[PDB]
Ligand binder design. Structure first.
Ligand code: ZN
Ligand code: ZN
Ligand code: ZN
Lengths: 49, 114, 65, 85, 43, 56, 262
């Protein structure tokens, strides 16, 4: 714990001490580049890709 | 992301011996016993039992790093006394004391109604 | 959200008495310390674990989902 | 004409730490590239240790060109250099 | 395959179909959890 | 001053530092993941041919 | 004769006793094995089939793991890593099912008693959730609103607290010795008077107060250790100490066996 460091109890850590949930959100759009042409949300099948 | 295997602390790894005994050249009749996957619990007790024996001269336990569940016990006895025999005697005495304590605790618990 | 299952410091189970703690605070109108002592919390670790907890689970359940 | 004869050299005969490091690195690189080894190896495989042993035994055939600011250079064999370290 | 944020009713819509809830005008159209087996550990 | 005096490096890692009384003065602890990602191009030699084969 | 135990008091999940004619190292090792080396049964794996509560699957799984489970017959149970089984066979694991859902306007509280044992215990009183509250509900797990369905399976394996604190059979293990400063092990921090600043310990009444007339006893050693063991509920304190002693003896015997083999 030198240099202001700290020692944390492993038992407490695994027992519910300072556990956190991190949520990250990704956004996607089908923005149209040219009329009549738009992106599609489909699983690629390796054909023509 | 690379935390140590928690179960590995008390479980022997593949191709790993529980005890590794090697000679020590620092002093005559000195040996080093590396205990794997063990903590202060057994090392301190074994060393304390060893120090209680008159024949045993030096008995010191060292933990290299908290990350690794392993320690080293340096044992030096008098001439003509094999350190392994001293360790075996200390372990037998520890077992006898533990059995006596268990029997006493059981008797006391049985005697008490609660 | 919910009261911790076990005390962080020692590991004593404290989740059983949270409802009893609330009942003692409300039904019997007892003070925090007296209620905690009655519940059987001697070490201050469990005392602060129970006292400092906040019931955010009810607030989350206030929403329709 | 710039080259100075073997004698009448004003540079320090004692080996320099930079020179020692450079010689060790060059010898280790050569050994790693399957270069001949002039010292018998007693169960040693690390190139740096082999280079250190060769320097201790003065078996390194390298040279040092002490370059003066003007441009003149003085040649020094590893064997004659004195390693204070 | 999909649920409504408010109605919370299954839709099971397909491709080239409106993404608006049939019961209400809301069109959040959340999706239900995967049917694949999921396992977690207390560690 | 952006690409000649100071330029980005391939073989290098960066991360937090923690104290360790049980380490030698010249010895520095390294994460296993960083060690795996970072590599050294050791040339094959008869001295360590077996060791390199085992590593491969 | 050896070391003897003087149980000052006993309870359902709390026993205070005194150990005499025992070394400090032995007492410390006993405490360590009792807090860490005692096998216990706790939920290890959580499989979610239909969860829609406000909480998270990992969160609820962690909460379930800490739930105490009966482990009186833990010795009969075998570690999963030891027995040759495909996955969580009845011989090495206990299987429970948690099912719940809300209704019109009454929140559904999930407790330990809601867990239902599904595996065959073969007449073994192991894996039953521990209930100690007066109401008997148990440990609160979560709360479900209308339309929130909770449906999961829990597999509990034999393990020790060293791998995870959830297996800890004892919450707090108080260990004290030398109430009066006879061995000079501790130098009390004082500003006006050491005795006044530091209140006398409860165990002080069980030892003769020191007399200033006599000199310091340099031959004295730690003895008469006052130990209070409290059990979470999985194992009674008496069985907790018995199992700790058994585990320490087994470890010493394993060391001896390794020495003999090598
Ligand atoms: Zn506590
Ligand atoms: Zn809708
Ligand atoms: Zn099995």
């Amino acid at each position: 714990n030198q240099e202001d460091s700290m020692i944390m109890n492993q038992s407490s850590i695994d027992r519910g001490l300072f556990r956190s949930l991190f949520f990250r959100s990704y956004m996607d759009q089908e923005k149209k580049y040219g009329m009549s042409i738009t992106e599609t949300f489909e699983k690629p099948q390796r054909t023509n890709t | 992301m690379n935390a140590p295997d928690r179960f590995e602390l008390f479980l022997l790894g593949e191709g790993e011996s529980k005890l590794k005994i090697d000679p020590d050249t620092k002093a005559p009749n000195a040996v080093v016993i590396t205990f794997e996957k063990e903590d202060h619990t057994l090392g301190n007790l074994i060393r304390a039992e060893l120090l209680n024996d008159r024949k045993v001269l030096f008995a010191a336990y060292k933990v290299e790093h908290p990350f690794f569940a392993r320690f080293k016990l340096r044992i030096q006895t008098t001439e003509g006394y094999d350190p392994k025999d001293a360790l075996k005697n200390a372990c037998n005495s520890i077992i006898n004391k533990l059995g006596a304590l268990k029997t006493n605790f059981e008797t006391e618990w049985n005697l008490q109604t609660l | 959200m919910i009261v911790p299952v076990r005390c962080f410091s020692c590991g004593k189970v404290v989740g059983d008495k949270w409802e009893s703690y609330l009942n003692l605070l409300q039904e019997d109108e007892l003070d925090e310390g007296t209620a905690l002592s009655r519940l059987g919390l001697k070490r201050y670790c469990c005392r602060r674990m129970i006292l400092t907890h906040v019931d955010l689970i009810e607030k989350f359940l206030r929403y329709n989902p | 004409e710039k080259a100075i004869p073997k004698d009448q050299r004003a540079t320090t005969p004692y080996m320099t730490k930079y020179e020692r490091a450079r010689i060790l690195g060059t010898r280790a690189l050569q050994i790693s590239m399957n270069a001949p080894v002039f010292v018998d190896l007693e169960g040693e495989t690390d190139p740096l240790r082999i280079a250190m042993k060769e320097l201790a035994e003065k078996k390194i055939p390298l040279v040092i060109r002490r370059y003066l600011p003007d441009g003149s250079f003085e040649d020094w064999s590893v064997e004659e250099l004195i390693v204070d370290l | 395959k999909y649920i409504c944020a408010e109605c919370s009713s299954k839709l099971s819509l397909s491709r080239t179909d409106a993404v608006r809830c049939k019961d209400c005008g809301h069109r959040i159209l959340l999706k239900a959890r995967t049917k694949r087996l999921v396992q977690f550990e207390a560690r | 001053r952006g690409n000649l005096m100071g330029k980005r490096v391939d073989f290098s890692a960066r991360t937090v530092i923690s104290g360790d009384p049980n380490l030698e003065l010249d010895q520095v602890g390294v994460p296993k993941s960083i060690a795996k990602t970072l590599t050294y191009p050791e040339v094959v030699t008869p001295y360590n041919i077996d060791r390199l084969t085992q590593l491969v | 004769e050896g070391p003897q135990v003087k149980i000052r008091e006993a309870s359902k999940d709390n026993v205070d006793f005194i150990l005499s004619n025992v070394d400090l190292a032995m007492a410390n090792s006993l405490r360590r094995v009792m807090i860490a080396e005692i096998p216990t049964l706790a939920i290890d794996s959580v499989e979610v089939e239909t969860n829609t509560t406000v909480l998270a699957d990992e969160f609820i799984a962690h909460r379930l793991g800490l739930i105490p489970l009966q482990s009186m017959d833990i010795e009969q149970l075998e570690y999963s890593r030891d027995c040759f089984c495909e996955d969580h066979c009845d011989k090495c694991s206990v299987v429970l099912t948690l099912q719940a859902f809300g209704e019109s306007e009454s929140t559904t509280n999930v407790y330990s008693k809601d867990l239902v044992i599904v595996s065959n215990l073969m007449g073994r009183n192991i894996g039953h959730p521990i209930i100690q509250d007066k109401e008997g509900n148990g440990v609160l797990i979560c709360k479900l609103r209308k339309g929130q369905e909770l449906k999961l399976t829990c597999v509990a394996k034999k393990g020790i607290a060293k791998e995870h604190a959830k297996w800890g059979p004892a919450a707090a293990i108080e260990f004290e010795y030398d109430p009066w400063n006879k061995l000079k092990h501790t130098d009390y921090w004082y500003e006006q008077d050491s005795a006044k600043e530091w209140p006398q310990s409860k165990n002080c009444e069980y030892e003769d107060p020191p007399n200033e007339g006599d000199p310091f006893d340099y031959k004295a050693q730690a003895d008469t250790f006052y130990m209070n063991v409290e059990s979470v509920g999985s194992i009674p304190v008496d069985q907790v100490v018995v199992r700790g002693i058994d585990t320490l003896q087994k470890k010493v015997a394993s060391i001896l066996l390794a020495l003999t083999q090598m």
